[PDB]
Design a protein around this nucleic acid. Structure first.
Length: 49
RNA sequence: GAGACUUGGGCAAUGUGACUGCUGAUCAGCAGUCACAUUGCCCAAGU
RNA sequence: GACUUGGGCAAUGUGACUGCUGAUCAGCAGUCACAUUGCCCAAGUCUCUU
């Protein structure tokens, strides 16, 4: 923090390896194991015309 | 994306300008302290 | 009666040393303002983009 020249290029955007949440990790089903099926309910709200 | 324009947060310096504060030495005046010199007086002794 | 030594009381001075005031001069420091041209970010308006 005492240095000054370190901020001459402060626009240096940081790059990261993205990752998935816990439920998304290793969720690919295999043969012979019980998995979960999540139905997607939806509700159209626009006027019926 | 290319850009122009403005306020910002600043980073820099090239100037330049003025402000403020302090130390030290010297001189003068005054006050006071150390020693020293001169003219006396008197005393203490010894021979 | 000379000779010697020492001390004390005086006055008349001198040599300096500090203390205070004022003045003079040299010597340092902390700033501040501000024109000039530069650099990196933040948010804005517009051409274009669309």
């Amino acid at each position: 923090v005492t240095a000054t020249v370190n901020k001459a290029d402060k626009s240096k955007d940081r790059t990261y390896k993205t990752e998935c949440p816990l439920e998304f990790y290793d969720a690919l089903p295999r043969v012979g194991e019980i998995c979960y099926a999540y139905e997607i309910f939806l509700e159209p709200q626009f006027e019926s015309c």
